[PDB]
């Protein structure tokens, strides 16, 4: 045994609840996972969780640095988040500089891939984009296609889709697959007509990314052009709020509800394979009941972010346990981090695996339109990251 | 009436003298201006300068942070640098957060142009790229040109040439001129033939940016394709290094020297319109002297960066004087910065005018070949930022 520990963690997420991973939403996950870890660590150990606002931007680098200064030079033992690409950069870098471990269910951009230096203390629990591109690459090697057009949106602020398709690119690039790139700003004036024109100009297979509503518009504009008959193959990445199917992702209670249903017939959606388990149920229930008595409703099943942070917590308490046993202390940041890499464990929803680079393996699903008359949408296939194998559902 | 002041200055530049703005090459300039200034401010006032290696990267962020956090929570009174684009962003952000005034002869990219918030405390004493672009935009209106190609090297690291042409692009895209982009890594293998061929596809007016040698390469190949001589109008920006915009640019004591002179008959160079005066001569003598006394092989003299930081100090001092008159203190960076904005003062080389946005107005000149036989390259015309008039010479 050893004396009771006193772990200080700095959580950095956006207070703004308009984000799938805001504090209000992630906190419940952390606390839960924290109540389960106790009773791996010396009896009596405690956790002092500071929830600061990231504003999904600079603020994080600010709050982190001010604390470290006010505290007269003392830094936290664990840093969770940020999740936003631009915000997770400096914090990550500084964490590496200070030998502080940083775990995050965000920071999915392909740049955090190179952890030989800059991002050496970063461990990613959610599937990076590159992973999703490893899948598309596989999916592509299946239909035997070799060319593709990447059509995405770019707000020059958060650029979620820019980074998203960047993964498809980084991967398709290495393998040689040819790629046509077309970007546009949805927020600003939409000239969808152009999009479609270039599409019907470049390739016959298209991989898109933009707000669900923007994808609809593009699907219609192209439908009216009779491109939705079987000459083209449309795809759109929707990894976090993919649940509209089973009800109809085209349906909107809108008048265009019919054209939409038609066009979407040629539209396949790639999302995350979210497995369940009794545990996960109880977790989901409790996390839901909290966010709710807070003024927010939840998307039925907790999102991948909430699940990830829960598992993040464990993964840390799992590595601090091994580091301790060997003799070192919590202050040996890199040591801890190295423990969190290249391993497999039981998360709140099932198996979880972090590759030898500190990036979690991902599992994705593809949704298509099984019965056109009705507009029935169902997963036609799964792909398994670690395994490295794709497969059509029964 | 006032007590002796002790300004704590934090200079952030590269230790490596490969940069036209290394600490060793800039320190003298700073000290010189310091003497002249320490003899405006209260008697007994003393400057404490801290020269720290920016490393043109994250180092600059780390140093600043480690300095402040370590020794209390006391930040410096004035930060000088960094110059490098990527390394100035954080330091500038952290400075605008701590209400600290930040002056630099770099950070010329178009992003630091938005100061309604994150760069509120940044003043640029050297001509930004967007001004250099406003220059081109006038040259283009002059010749009735409305289209252009932007060919540049993109190392995906420091990326100076990319930021350079980004300025031209920002200005053109707004005014309506159409452009065609084209990037290549010059760190890798140069497919100079493809480049030249795409050029043959695009526009007749070509804006270029790359290593002095690379512009020459392309020039030979284009020449080989007969694209030189009247057909296309090549351009290339060389704003700082005198060894590059100096007459005989095409020479290399190489076998191609004849051919090169032949190609450059169509290549026009864009650089800064540096002025001089008696006092500047004294300055250059000492700066030259100090640099050599440090072993550093005298480049040629003082670059825009050196002359820039010298006038940077006079600018800070002029502003302190005034702010220290309205009943404010050295710790009110904001009040100090707004004082350095929208004004004109005497630098070592002459007039210096900062616009109402914290950006130094820039005056440019164009270098063309006036005798194909000889190889003579004299200045054809100039542009004056503030006035905004481009004028051809006799």
């Amino acid at each position: 045994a050893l004396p009771p520990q006193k772990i200080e963690v700095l959580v950095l997420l956006p207070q703004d609840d308009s984000y799938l991973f805001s504090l209000t939403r992630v906190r419940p996950a952390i606390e839960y996972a924290l109540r389960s870890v106790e009773g791996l660590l010396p009896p009596g150990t405690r956790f002092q969780v500071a929830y600061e606002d990231s504003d999904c931007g600079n603020r994080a680098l600010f709050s982190l640095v001010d604390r470290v200064a006010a505290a007269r030079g003392a830094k936290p033992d664990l840093i969770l988040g940020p999740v936003c690409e631009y915000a997770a950069a400096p914090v990550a870098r500084l964490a590496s500089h200070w030998d502080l471990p940083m775990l995050s269910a965000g920071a999915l951009a392909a740049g955090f891939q190179h952890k030989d230096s800059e991002y050496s203390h970063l461990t990613r629990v959610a599937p990076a984009y590159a992973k999703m591109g490893e899948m598309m690459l596989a999916l592509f090697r299946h239909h035997h296609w070799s060319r593709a057009a990447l059509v995405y949106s770019d707000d020059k602020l958060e650029r979620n889709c820019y980074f998203t398709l960047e993964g498809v690119h980084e991967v398709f690039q290495e393998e040689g697959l040819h790629t046509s790139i077309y970007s546009f700003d949805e927020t600003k004036d939409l000239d969808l007509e152009d999009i479609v024109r270039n599409i019907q100009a470049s390739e016959r297979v298209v991989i898109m990314c933009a707000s669900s509503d923007t994808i609809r518009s593009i699907m219609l504009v192209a439908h009216r052009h009779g491109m939705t008959s079987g000459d083209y193959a449309f795809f759109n990445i929707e990894l976090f709020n993919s649940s509209s199917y089973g009800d109809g992702s085209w349906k909107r209670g809108d008048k265009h509800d019919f054209e939409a249903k038609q066009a979407y017939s040629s539209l396949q959606t790639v999302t995350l394979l979210r497995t369940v388990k009794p545990e996960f149920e109880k977790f989901s229930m409790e996390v839901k009941s909290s966010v709710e008595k807070q003024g927010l409703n939840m998307e039925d099943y907790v999102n991948m972010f909430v699940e990830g942070f829960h598992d993040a917590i464990l993964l840390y308490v799992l590595a601090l346990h091994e580091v301790l046993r060997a003799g070192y202390s919590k202050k040996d940041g890199g040591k801890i981090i190295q423990q969190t890499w290249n391993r497999t464990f039981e998360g709140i929803a099932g198996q979880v695996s972090i590759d030898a680079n500190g990036d979690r393996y991902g599992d994705f699903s593809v949704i298509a339109m099984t019965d056109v008359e009705a507009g029935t949408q169902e997963v036609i296939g799964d792909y398994f990251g670690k395994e490295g194998r794709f497969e059509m559902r029964p | 009436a006032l007590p002796p002041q002790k300004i704590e200055v934090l200079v952030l530049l590269p230790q490596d003298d490969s940069y036209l703005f290394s600490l060793t090459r800039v320190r003298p300039a700073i000290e010189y201006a310091l003497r002249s200034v320490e003899g405006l401010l209260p008697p007994g006032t003393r400057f404490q300068v801290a020269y720290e290696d920016s490393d043109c990267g994250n180092r600059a962020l780390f140093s600043l942070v480690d300095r402040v956090a370590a020794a209390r929570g006391a930040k410096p009174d004035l930060i000088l640098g960094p110059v490098c684009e990527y390394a100035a962003a954080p330091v500038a952000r952290l400075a605008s957060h701590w209400d600290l005034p930040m002056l630099s002869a770099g950070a010329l990219a178009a992003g630091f142009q938005h100061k309604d918030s994150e760069y509120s405390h940044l003043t640029r004493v050297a001509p930004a790229y967007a001004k250099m672009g406003e220059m081109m935009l006038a040259l283009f209106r002059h010749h009735h040109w409305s289209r252009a190609a932007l060919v540049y090297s993109d190392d995906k690291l420091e990326r100076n040439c990319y930021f350079t042409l980004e300025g031209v692009h920002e200005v053109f895209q707004e005014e309506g001129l159409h452009t065609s982009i084209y990037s290549f890594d010059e760190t890798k293998d140069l497919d100079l033939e493809d480049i030249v061929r795409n050029i043959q596809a695009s526009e007749r007016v070509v804006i270029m940016c790359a290593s002095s040698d690379t512009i020459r390469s392309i020039m030979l190949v284009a020449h080989r394709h007969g694209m030189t001589s009247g057909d296309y109008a090549f351009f290339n920006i060389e704003l700082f290094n005198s060894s590059s915009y100096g007459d005989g640019s095409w020479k290399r004591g190489d076998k191609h020297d004849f051919e090169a002179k032949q190609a450059y008959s169509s290549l026009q160079t864009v650089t800064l319109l540096r002025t001089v005066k008696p006092e500047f001569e004294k300055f250059s003598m000492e700066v030259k002297s100090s640099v050599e006394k440090q072993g550093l092989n005298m480049e040629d003299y003082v670059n825009m960066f050196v002359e820039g930081f010298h006038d940077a100090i006079l600018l800070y001092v002029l502003a302190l004087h005034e702010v220290l008159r309205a009943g404010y203190s050295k710790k009110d960076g904001g009040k100090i910065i707004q004082q350095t904005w929208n004004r004109t003062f005497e630098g070592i080389a002459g007039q210096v005018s900062i616009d109402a946005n914290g950006d130094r107005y820039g005056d440019f000149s164009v270098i063309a070949m006036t005798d194909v036989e000889a190889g003579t390259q004299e200045v054809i015309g100039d542009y004056f930022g503030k006035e905004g008039r481009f004028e051809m010479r006799p």
Binding site: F112, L150, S183 | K156, R159
Partner: peptide, 21 residues
């Protein structure tokens, strides 16, 4: 295309212009 061989400095500021070969 608009991605270049890499994007090393992802998460810095550079987001005012694309790339392409």
């Amino acid at each position: 295309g608009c991605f270049g061989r890499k994007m090393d400095r992802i998460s810095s500021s550079s987001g005012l212009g694309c790339k392409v070969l």
